[PDB]
Amino acid sequence: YATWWIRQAITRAMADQARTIRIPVHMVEVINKLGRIQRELLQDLGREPTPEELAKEMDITPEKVLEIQQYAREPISLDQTIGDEGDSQLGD
Amino acid sequence: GSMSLSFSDPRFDDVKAPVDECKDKDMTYAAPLFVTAEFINNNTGEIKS
Amino acid sequence: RMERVVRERMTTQDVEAITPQTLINIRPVVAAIKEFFGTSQLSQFMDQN
Amino acid sequence: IFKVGDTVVYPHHGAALVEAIETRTIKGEQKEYLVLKVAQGDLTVRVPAENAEYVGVRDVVGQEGLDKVFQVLRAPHTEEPTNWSRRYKANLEKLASGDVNKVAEVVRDLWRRDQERGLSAGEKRMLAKARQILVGELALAESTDDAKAETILDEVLAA
């Protein structure tokens, strides 16, 4: 019985406390489902999944898929590579 | 120790695109890699090639 | 990395239903190759003056 | 039981052709391996003839099997546990077991659900997998041209 609650709480706290820009849990779930589906299609189909076919498997519209792919993008740091190496912070 | 996975015979196809088309269209000049994988079970005994 | 993944999933997955297609994950291998050829100090930009 | 040239049915990969009765030895014991290949996965499997019935390599559905899974697909009164998770794990075990009667029951149950309720894309995918293996099974059981097996299967679901 306890494993159920543990997994639920861990996945919830992962969902809404692991991004600098907080994405609510439903959009985290659809992002994770899209990522899993595209991963399994990359592993099985081999051919890289095109967005509209991902929509077909996803049973949603391609523009919703594009919006999901836009939302998933996470922020880089301003203190990383100049262009290639970390000589100067990117924020300069 | 009741099962095992093995690899053999790396093998390439032809390149999917020539050099100049690769340079023009920003696609990397690569070729697929094909490997013969074999799953073996110990207790009942099968090869999954 | 791929071997760690494959020997993780050897145990959790049910026996007599699997194949190397289901076991092998090629994403970390291609990720490693892509991370080597792009953004590495030895995969240098070709200098043609 | 499994001679050469036999279109023998192996779970879960459906029917398969045997190429030869291979005498590959291990530990100085010339076991009677048989090479069998399927058309979908493009894989070759060697199975010893002694424990060939242990793996449960079946034989194709004939006529009694066709009308039996027919009666199952048309069987009324089927109901499932209220919590969808119990239903999911039950019919997942039921497809993982892989017998034709239970795969038929799974596909007809989910079709009855899908007609009105609808299911998730994962649940549609579980259907699609069960439907694919079942239509392969039927199209090599009646030996009847996978597309025509799909059209007859869609004919029979409506009853």
Q: ∠ CA(D112), CA(D113), CA(D116), 5° rounding?
A: 95
Query: How far out from the chain centre does Cα D132 lie?
Result: 9
Q: Within an 8 Å CB–CB cutoff, is residue A85 touching chain C?
A: yes
Q: Does the distance separating the beta carbons of A43 and C39 come in below 8 Å?
A: no
Q: Within an 8 Å CB–CB cutoff, is residue B44 touching chain C?
A: yes
3-state secondary structure chain A: CHHHHHHHHHHHHHHHCCCCCCCCHHHHHHHHHHHHHHHHHHHHCCCCCCHHHHHHHHCCCHHHHHHHHHHHCCCCCCCCCCCCCCCCCCCC
Residues from chain B that touch C32, judged by Cβ atoms under 8 A, are none
Query: How far out from the chain centre does Cα C38 lie?
Result: 16
Q: Within an 8 Å CB–CB cutoff, is residue A45 touching chain C?
A: no
Residues from chain C that touch A84, judged by Cβ atoms under 8 A, are 39
Residue D14 φ/ψ, nearest 5 degrees: 70, -150
- Asked whether the beta carbons of D40 and D13 are under 8 A apart, the reply is yes
Q: In D5-99, which ranges are continuous DSSP H helix?
A: 64-73, 84-97
Per 3-state DSSP, what percentage of chain D is helix, strand, and coil (rounded to 5)?
45, 15, 40
Q: Does the distance separating the beta carbons of B45 and D45 come in below 8 Å?
A: no
For tokens 């080597």, name the residue.
Answer: C36
- Asked whether the beta carbons of D28 and D46 are under 8 A apart, the reply is no
Alpha-carbon distance D150 to D159, whole Å? 15
User: Quick one: tokens of C4?
Assistant: 């760690």
Residue D120 φ/ψ, nearest 5 degrees: -80, 165
For tokens 């690569």, name the residue.
Answer: B30
Q: Which helix (H) or strand (E) holds D10?
A: none
Q: Considering just the CA atoms, what is the radius of gyration of chain D in Å?
A: 18
Alpha-carbon distance A65 to A69, whole Å? 6
Q: Output the CA torsion sign for D14, D17, D19, D21.
A: positive
Best of D12, D44, D46, D51 to disrupt the B interface by mutation (most B CBs within 10 Å)?
Answer: D46
- Asked whether the beta carbons of D108 and D154 are under 8 A apart, the reply is no
Q: Within an 8 Å CB–CB cutoff, is residue D121 touching chain A?
A: yes
Query: How far out from the chain centre does Cα C22 lie?
Result: 14
Query: How far out from the chain centre does Cα D67 lie?
Result: 16
- Asked whether the beta carbons of D6 and D19 are under 8 A apart, the reply is no
- Asked whether the beta carbons of A79 and A89 are under 8 A apart, the reply is yes
Alpha-carbon distance B48 to C5, whole Å? 19
Facing residue for B44 by CB, picked from D44, D45, D54: D54
User: Quick one: tokens of D133?
Assistant: 């293996």
3-state secondary structure of B33: strand
3-state secondary structure of B8: strand
